[PDB]
Paper text:
RimKPA was crystalized in the absence of its substrates; ATP, cdG, and glutamate whereas RimKPS was crystalized with both ATP and cdG present in the cryoprotectant. ADP and glutamate, of presumed cellular origin, were resolved in the RimKPA structure whereas ADP alone was resolved in the RimKPS structure. Within the RimKPS and RimKPA structures, the bound nucleotide was interpreted as ADP rather than ATP in the predicted ATP binding site, potentially due to a dephosphorylation event prior to crystallization. For RimKPS and RimKPA, the ADP molecule interacts with a core set of six side chains: K141, E178, I180, F210, S212, and N213. Within the upper loops, the β‐sheet of RimKPS is shorter than that of RimKPA, potentially allowing more flexibility in the loop. Although there is a high degree of sequence similarity between the active sites of the different RimK proteins, clear tertiary structure differences were present within their binding sites, with the RimKPS binding site appearing significantly more open than that of RimKEC. The residues H215, R216 and R211 are oriented in opposite directions in RimKEC and RimKPS, with all three pointing towards the active site in RimKEC, thus reducing the size of the active site cleft and encasing the ATP/ADP binding site. Previous work has shown that RimKPF and RimKPS are biochemically interchangeable, having similar ATPase activity levels and the ability to add an unlimited number of glutamate residues to RpsF, suggesting they have similar modes of action in vivo. Consequently, and as expected the addition of RimBPS stimulated RimKPS ATPase activity in a concentration dependent manner. The more closed active site conformation of RimKEC compared to RimKPA, itself presenting a more closed conformation than RimKPS, provides a possible explanation for the differences seen in V max and the enzymatic changes seen upon RimB binding.
Numbering used by the authors:
A (entry chain D): 1 to 291
B (entry chain C): 1 to 210, 219 to 290
C (entry chain B): 1 to 206, 218 to 292
D (entry chain A): 1 to 290
The structure:
């Protein structure tokens, strides 16, 4: 197969690993910076050009779209799709995932377990917003399109109101979420490829904090996931319509709760922890479903 | 009916006219600034609140979403949809329309007549981009999400290259389009409601550059407008069309078109016919 | 006199009042939207044009520059200065005031009382930043050029760290400041014209503005703060602390509605009266 | 000496060369990403901290401030100045240079030769703006703070009006400048350190175009500069109040004309062309004036 890898940086672990796994399995791997791609839209002969030459004869494309102000990245993926190239994840599904507001609304409607969650931008009655989410303690995230830029635990409704008012000032979309203290600042990252959770790992916060992220001074370890945690991860990915996804889960008193569904999950964390060829299994999935 | 009108400004002609037409026809009309709406997402009892009180018992919603950095506006419309409220245009369709890149790609694939069109952001070979669009003269638009912020006619490939390089500097998505000189700086704005073009008008430039009046549209211009709206999946849309040597060409499909221009020119109750459409399909 | 009023919004109270006070005192008042002004820079005959016609014979200019992404507004003021027109406040001084980081650094160096203050953008050791400012409780402001867009009181170092990390995400300049609880959510706004505090008022949180007799050291602080920035007309915000008056902000074009409604003083008038005396030949 | 180098990227040619030249001459060279510096402002004991540890005992600082949305970078340089550290270029001077509108106004007032130049943002009468600058052909630049983001040569007043209207739409500060066709798409880049032009080079455009930039398929070569070109470069730098500056000059029919004054000029172009230790002479300047 000839496979395109849509990546802003070819020197990043996850992109390097995808070209390795591909080359290893006898495929021709081309890294494309989507911004440097330009195209002619047309019924008959639609073209994508790159550094003066046309992009032809591609069998599959792996979209690794970053959390940028990038409607253009999805447009380049869409051209590939319309020119017959098989996508790892469809542009339709990626657009659903990257809109965190839309993503949670869709999971909520299909009955996926979520924390109690509120949305706001310029609310006039902030006390009313806090009351709607069963009050403090509340986690308060800001959204800059795709990225959940800042996260604050507010213990009292006074602190919650004070922080929401600050974020309002910055004209940002605000997310207010029930704090799940039982988790102990830990989450399960389940890694979906096709109909299977191929790899899983627990993330843990530092001695003091609640922020579980791997790239914020955080230990990762092996974990045996429950059948309902597996079932939740697969269902979450299927609702978004993704073939490959990372699903973040919280172990709560009332079962597993989905935090995020990522349409292009990082590979360094999961591979170092599990010693699994995740990059390999992604390429292996393309081999079977490319047709 | 109780009808919500999602508008940032209730004092704008198009919003005023929609509440008038509604009140006139015996409906309860509520104007909602989507940003001041806040909600709880939930399977069982999903709520939208507004200035301390809940929003209940709405039968239909008219989304007038502006060309802002507003993923939130679509989210408020989506809650209404999921809470059973009938939308004039579905959030799915509006998202398609507001992404001008995606919009033209979708029209192109379904064989709707378009000008020859190219897209770029950081192209390394600009001469190659110009060659792909059959060269100058070229119209060059910048895109800031939904809005086509700036527009330049470039007569020579030198000017085209010089302008594209400038817009590249501003890190903006660039659209390069075949200039249709036959149009004479005029376009047909067709106004779609359901399966019908209810109103049309010609727009004209000043004596030199590239005034609105009545115009009888061809059967193929009508058919193009309806097909363009159906491809986007819109019930109500404004479709801009160029009269070219090789037939009608679609410029834009607007999911919430302005009412002042079309109503002043045609003297038609367009606001009324939109409310009348909600009455039948609600 | 012929006086230009550089205002981004010509319908606003403060601009209207400045043309009134001027007309009342027999002057010719022209309101200029700085963005709609265009100019040719030149040694001999430097021109400013506006809506097709040249701007000539101006004796003084009142710069009301807004907190925008506006290097252009200062450029229009600079042309006026270079064309011999007397400015109410010099472009040099306005540039000092609008850079809130630079403003506090300059006040600090000349020994003006300030709250204990820290600056950050992408700090690696946030606990270290908090320690440098004598810890919580801390007030945490974000800066978008001129405006202090958002303000959060953080009671504990945990909350301080959590909020700073959030603002870091937004790639904004961050200000960390000692919380002065003694103030009771109140500040003195002193209004400087020349060598005099012509008007003052207390502001209160939930809000209310009211009359206040200012101390001799509060007056002296306001005048010194304005003189350090090099402003002839300025609003100086002050906190009453246990260890004396502390300057919060120095505004190079302070609003007139608040101060005039509260004091019933012709502040617009006294500004025009200042131009009459110091405009000179 | 202990010398701080304020640079976002320590792996860039110009920063590497400045630490080399310093180390070579027996100095302690520390690279500081200004954004990762945080400080306490205070009369008595004003601190700058960096990755948990304080920054102490610095004798001089070399500011390499980029064309970013960075009021913060100047603030970090200002702390160093106020804490007694000698700057290669003063924060005051750098602020003058980076504001291209202010920079040209200041050069114009002190009688430095410039092209005929106009400024606009939201002009109502664009034909009037074009007339004020002696009409087409006109060069039209957009400004995003410090950077001259786009540059367009407009041959006719029709094209000039059409391009200005487009840039107006983007709510950007617009610069309109007399096109100097005699230059042949070539400029002199003079390199100032103290009271001396230590190095110079001609830049040339491709067979067709006018854009003389090195990173646009453009030849650089050695050039003997006139005494008036030297005098112009030094005077331009002195008006901005810079000790180290790159001054771009056009050879015109009516003498040398200054295009730009750069407060932190690149070193790769000038050093490759001249084979001079420019990095060395900058460090040598700090040694004498510190
Ligand atoms: N509502 C919440 N309740 C409990 N923990 C939460 C909550 N929101 C976020 N967290 C914690 O913060 C971590 C990171 O936040 P999240 O927004 O899910 O991810 P990211 O930082 O990658 O955007 C989570 O894995 C979890 O440990
Ligand atoms: N490629 C083109 N060929 C001919 N006319 C064009 C072209 N692009 C734009 N125009 C003219 O400009 C009008 C509006 O410009 P356009 O960028 O399409 O939309 P907007 O009105 O939103 O700026 C069109 O209706 C048409 O009259
Ligand atoms: N560090 C602080 N200590 C005490 N009160 C403060 C502090 N910072 C702000 N305030 C209070 O906040 C209000 C002023 O808000 P702010 O945005 O800082 O000022 P401005 O009106 O100049 O923008 C006043 O009531 C003032 O007392
Ligand atoms: N008005 C003009 N007349 C002649 N040549 C010009 C003019 N403006 C720019 N140029 C040429 O274009 C080159 C590009 O400079 P420019 O892009 O404006 O500077 P920078 O990229 O350093 O901000 C100049 O060095 C000069 O050779």
């Amino acid at each position: 197969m000839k496979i395109a890898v849509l990546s802003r940086n070819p020197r990043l672990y996850s992109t390097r690993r995808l070209v390795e796994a591909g080359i290893e399995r006898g495929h021709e791997m081309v890294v494309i910076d989507t911004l440097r791609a330009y195209m002619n839209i047309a019924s008959h002969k639609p073209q994508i050009h790159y550094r003066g030459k046309p992009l032809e004869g591609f069998d599959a494309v792996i979209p690794r779209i970053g959390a940028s102000v990038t409607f253009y990245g999805c447009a380049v993926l869409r051209q590939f799709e319309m020119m017959g190239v098989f996508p790892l994840n469809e542009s339709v599904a990626i657009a659903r995932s990257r809109d965190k507001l839309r993503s949670l609304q869709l999971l909520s409607r299909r009955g996926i377990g979520l924390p109690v969650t509120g949305f706001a931008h310029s609310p006039d009655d902030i006390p009313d917003l806090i009351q709607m989410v069963n009050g403090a303690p509340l986690v308060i995230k800001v959204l800059e399109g795709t990225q959940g830029i800042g996260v604050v635990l507010c213990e009292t409704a006074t602190a919650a109101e004070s922080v929401i008012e600050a974020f309002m000032g910055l004209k940002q979309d605000i997310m207010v979420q029930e704090y799940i203290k039982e988790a102990g600042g830990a989450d399960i990252r389940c890694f979906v490829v096709g109909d299977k959770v191929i790899a899983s790992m627990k993330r843990q916060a530092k001695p003091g904090e609640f922020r579980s992220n791997l790239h914020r001074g955080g230990s990762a370890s092996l974990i045996k996931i429950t059948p309902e945690e597996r079932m939740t991860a697969l269902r979450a990915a299927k609702v978004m319509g993704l073939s490959v996804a990372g699903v973040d889960i919280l172990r709560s008193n009332h079962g597993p709760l989905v935090m995020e569904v990522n349409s292009s999950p990082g590979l360094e964390g999961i591979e170092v922890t599990t010693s699994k060829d995740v990059a390999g299994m992604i390429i292996e999935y393309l081999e079977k479903n490319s047709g």
